[PDB]
Write a protein that binds this ligand. Sequence first.
Ligand SMILES: *[C@@H]1O[C@H](CO)[C@@H](O)[C@H](O)[C@H]1NC(C)=O
Ligand SMILES: *[C@@H]1O[C@H](CO)[C@@H](O)[C@H](O)[C@H]1NC(C)=O
Lengths: 71, 48, 49, 49, 49, 291, 145, 96, 58, 58
Amino acid sequence: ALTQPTISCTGTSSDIGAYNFVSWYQQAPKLLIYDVTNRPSGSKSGNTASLTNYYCNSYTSSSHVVFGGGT
Amino acid sequence: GSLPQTRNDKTFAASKGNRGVQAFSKGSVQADLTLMFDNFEVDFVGAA
Amino acid sequence: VNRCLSWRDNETSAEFSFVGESTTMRENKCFEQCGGWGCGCFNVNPSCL
Amino acid sequence: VNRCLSWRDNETSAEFSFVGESTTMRENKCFEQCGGWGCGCFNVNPSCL
Amino acid sequence: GEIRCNSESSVLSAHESCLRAPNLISYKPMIDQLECTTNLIDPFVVFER
Amino acid sequence: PHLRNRPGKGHNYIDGMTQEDATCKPVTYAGACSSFDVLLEKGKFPLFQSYAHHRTLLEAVHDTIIAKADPPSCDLQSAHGNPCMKEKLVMKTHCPNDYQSAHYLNNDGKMASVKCPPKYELTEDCNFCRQMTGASLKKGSYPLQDLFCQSSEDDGSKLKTKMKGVCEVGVQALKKCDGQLSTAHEVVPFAVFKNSKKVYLDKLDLKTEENLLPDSFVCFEHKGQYKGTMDSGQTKRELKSFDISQCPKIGGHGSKKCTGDAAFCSAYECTAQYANAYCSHANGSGIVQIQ
Amino acid sequence: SYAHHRTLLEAVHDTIIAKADPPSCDLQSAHGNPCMKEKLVMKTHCPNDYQSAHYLNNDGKMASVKCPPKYELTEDCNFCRQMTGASLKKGSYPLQDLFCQSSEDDGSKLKTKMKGVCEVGVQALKKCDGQLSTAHEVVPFAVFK
Amino acid sequence: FVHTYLQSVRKEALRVFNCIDWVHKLTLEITDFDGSVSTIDLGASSSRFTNWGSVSLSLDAEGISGSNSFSFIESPGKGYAIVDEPFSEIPRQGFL
Amino acid sequence: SGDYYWSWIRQPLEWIGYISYSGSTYYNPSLESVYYCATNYFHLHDFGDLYWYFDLWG
Amino acid sequence: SGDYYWSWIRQPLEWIGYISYSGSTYYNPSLESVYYCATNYFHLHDFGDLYWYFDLWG
Ligand SMILES: *[C@@H]1O[C@H](CO)[C@@H](O)[C@H](O)[C@H]1NC(C)=O
Ligand SMILES: *[C@@H]1O[C@H](CO)[C@@H](O)[C@H](O)[C@H]1NC(C)=O
């Protein structure tokens, strides 16, 4: 899973570090940010994404979906 | 029987570079070598 | 090509099957030709006649 | 060594398997060389090329 | 005609069906690198002669 | 089954496909690894089978010998609309069934792999993914190319493809030509050097020289062996891998008593007490040099 | 061929051949001692279910290797391995191919004289420097009084 | 019962061969344009693919000079020699 | 119709698995053998099946 | 853990047998087919398994 406490979503090299497919949800949660930056503000750096109840999800190298711990 | 030996006027000997043997015998040949597509030219030779 | 050079003179090709079985004196040959787009075939190996 | 001298000219070695099947005229030879640490091999029996 | 074939394509492709004499290829297995070379009568030279 | 005593770590697994770590983490005589057992089938992968004691592509990747390409494996599930399958589509391969992934050495000299979406399998040409109901996919990835790797420090930054009469081989544009262009599929040998790209060759003139480095020794141990690892009663006679880093070097210190054959005794220090492992010299290992 | 001459064990029991110091240092109690030195230079082949194996050491006496209880000697007779529910044989495997006899001829001046040999087995014939072709070979041997 | 095996005394070998025929062979030094670093060797009715094309030799007079009935010995790294016996493909006691 | 991935999520979130349009099922490794169902229904990407961009929650 | 030999002794001493760390069992030849249990637990020798140096009696 991801590590959560601008909310920071920190992961391993498998998620976020490799793929730029990370999304955020506000809580039936509501999606706010997809594809790191796109909105229907966030960013990435190293293995940690940042967003300026909020949950983060990402795509792993094993074709799985990993959800954040939550803030 | 090291190579520099003459037998019935043949005098076999080592070829240059010791890659084989020769046979020195009386005779002659006619050689007419031919060139083809000979092209080797540069530009710096224009100066005198 | 292996079939092309080793063609027996008494063996008929499949193209001339309308001849079928005939009692006339006959022989069959195979000749290699050019292979390439200039010849008419995409492949560059030699064609057959 | 027994395989080394008795190498048939029409038999291909396993090292040159990328050649695989080819229609080109070809032959295969095997030559004995030195065997020993100076040659490059720990064994003292002759190597093969 | 030390190396002879049955068609122009076989000559131009060095097909394995071509016949040749024994021991045409000279091998120099010197310790650094092998030298594969041979001396062949150029048929074009004899044709022009 | 001495070929299953892999040099180095022997990690024959790929990132993401980590469901076979029981037998693909260091490959031993015991288990079965899908991404390694295909190499030992008779008639397939003959070049590696000749140089059977050298590292594979996955082993070389896990020893940091060969790097991993950018998008190491762009999944067809998430990146099927990206110009990924370009170097793969110029190769003519043949995958068996029930394989969800396949790795190869790309043009830059790194390792890249193609991964089908979950529950899909690669077709017979490894170009498309197809789904079969009630099929058990293998947990490894099929090695596409026949190659063997090693550790080298020789520099090759000035090395480049030099093929005569070839306008373009694979994905490399050697030159620009106009007119007739005979296009075909051919078996081209290739090599990869340090700090270089793939170098296709017209001829393969390669030689091997032996040495006494640790990668040239196969060290094993018995299961149930007295005073050794796994010292318990066994119902079958099976071997176990051993790490040569423990056997002391000649005139040096070590942690395990170690015995071996003539080459090992010349290189390492063979004990006079009861030994813990037997270290033979590798069947064919060494250093391979290409002309 | 010489089937009506004594074996090594028979020669030992007829006082023809003596028994070595530590006659057989058990691997159970002496695995950390420099025992297996002459055995490790021989290439043998033991069958299964054998707990002991005897050989004629360099001094001309009989020594043997005995595995700990319930263990058996491996295929190279170099290690002991344990199998559950296995019935070990009650004897010891003869490692070498030899026959013995009773002799009074003296051989105190007899020594190994091999040409071009720096070292055979555990005997250091001489001191040599440079190339050293090391191999496993079948060497005939004799033991005199 | 006697079992005999042969062993080599000296660590050297000699190669014995025969010359079926002799061939004329010309060595040429190709003083090329702007540089004379070119030396080639070629026989009768043969061509060599040098730079700027190829060079062929006719040598129409005589492509051969008969045969012989001696044998030749080569010691690698030491030279050659001639022995006055016919080259026999079947071993014979008391001969070479 | 539209190449959708119907997935199941739960909150005691945590992804459980998905069933695809083609009938392919993928499960969480831990659970291989409140509940919502959200699928990527509007932010479809032509280059990939980004099914974790969950919207239209159940 | 530590390569111990758990042995059984009796006094009507007399050694009965031992069970090893590896599961190997060795019995007295007479009994092959007060009770104490003492094992070499402190005076371990690196060169051999001197299991008859009994201490830590049961
Ligand atoms: C004639 O043809 C038949 C069938 O095509 C074949 O079996 C036979 O060998 C041929 N005769 C020859 C080649 O003389
Ligand atoms: C040619 O090779 C095949 C298979 O390698 C062999 O069976 C055959 O005898 C060979 N032909 C010869 C040696 O004339």
